Design a protein around this ligand. Structure first.
Ligand code: LSD
Ligand code: NA
Length: 274
């Protein structure tokens, strides 16, 4: 039997990575990675590949007493992804989001740590492109909230490929995105942006989102796709569904969003009644 690990298991592996970094025992940390795992930290630099090279990269950070304060982990429906915001202290405070893939043995196959110069207290180098990308991520949410579909599309390239949730079909083109946002507005979606980070690759950013929407039609639709399981609401005409997710965007050379992924799994959904 080979099987991909469940949402709950991936969430726990990401938290356990932080507990072991904090406990300071390098061998404990390394045993959480696959033998040929890849680490990219920060996003934009060369991958560190395999446990030997990971030992070389992490050894100094553990000697300097790095500390990772985990936030809330987010899953997906691809059997592998988990996203964990954290605050990393060492002088310095950095806000990061680790995008992690857990493999079939329960071990981290891959870890991509998104954080920019502008998410970090230990460097004051300016990165106006970072701030522009984070502001585009936030902007997506404001334009959904305001019911401004035409405006939302203005942020996106005609080449846009998006996946929501991670683990479903990749959708392409402004027409598919238009249809999503038009439905969100019809279900009174409200997206409240929390933490933002940027990559240092001239391209990525990410935002935690807390979203509410009308129970009808999304709840029964999504339950029937086996994407969530909620209790039955006392009043389905008034109830709301909450989804906590992280949206990752990729921005092209022209400043337009050409890639977008929303990370949430069944364990990131809830019924708000009322
Ligand atoms: C056209 C909008 C509609 C939608 O995107 C559907 C197609 C997807 O959620 C479906 C159920 C799952 C993903 C999917 C997309 C496309 C194809 C071809 C698929 O096969 C699948 C799939 O998972 O099977 C849904 O989006 C919603 C609009 C309020 C919600 C769902 C949840 C949400 O994606 C949360 C980030 C966001 C708030 O939109 C509800 C609505 C039923
Ligand atoms: Na900074």
């Amino acid at each position: 039997g080979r099987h991909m690990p469940a949402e709950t298991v991936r969430k726990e592996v990401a938290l356990e990575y932080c507990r072991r970094v904090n406990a300071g025992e390098l061998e404990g940390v390394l045993q959480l990675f696959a033998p040929d795992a890849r680490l990219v930290d920060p996003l934009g630099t060369e991958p560190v590949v395999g446990r030997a090279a990971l030992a070389a990269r992490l050894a100094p950070a553990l000697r300097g007493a790095v500390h990772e304060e985990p936030g809330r982990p987010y899953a997906a429906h691809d059997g592998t992804s988990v996203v964990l915001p954290a605050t990393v202290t060492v002088r310095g405070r950095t806000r990061v989001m680790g995008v992690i893939e857990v493999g079939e043995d329960g071990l981290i196959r891959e870890m991509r740590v998104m954080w920019g110069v502008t998410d970090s207290s230990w460097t004051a180098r300016p990165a106006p492109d970072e701030e522009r990308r984070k502001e585009l991520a936030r902007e997506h949410c404001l334009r959904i909230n305001d019911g401004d579909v035409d405006g939302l599309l203005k942020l996106y390239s005609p080449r846009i490929r998006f996946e929501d949730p991670v683990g479903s079909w990749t959708r392409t083109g402004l027409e598919a995105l238009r249809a999503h946002a038009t439905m969100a507005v019809g279900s009174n979606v409200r997206e409240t942006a929390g933490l933002t980070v940027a990559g240092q690759d001239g391209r990525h950013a990410a935002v935690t989102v807390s979203a509410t929407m009308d129970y009808l039609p999304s709840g029964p639709l999504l339950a029937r796709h086996h994407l969530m399981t909620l209790p039955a609401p006392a009043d389905p005409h008034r109830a709301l569904i909450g989804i906590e997710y992280v949206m990752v965007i990729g921005v092209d050379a022209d400043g337009l969003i050409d890639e977008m992924r929303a990370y949430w799994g069944a364990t990131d959904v809830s019924l708000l009644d009322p």
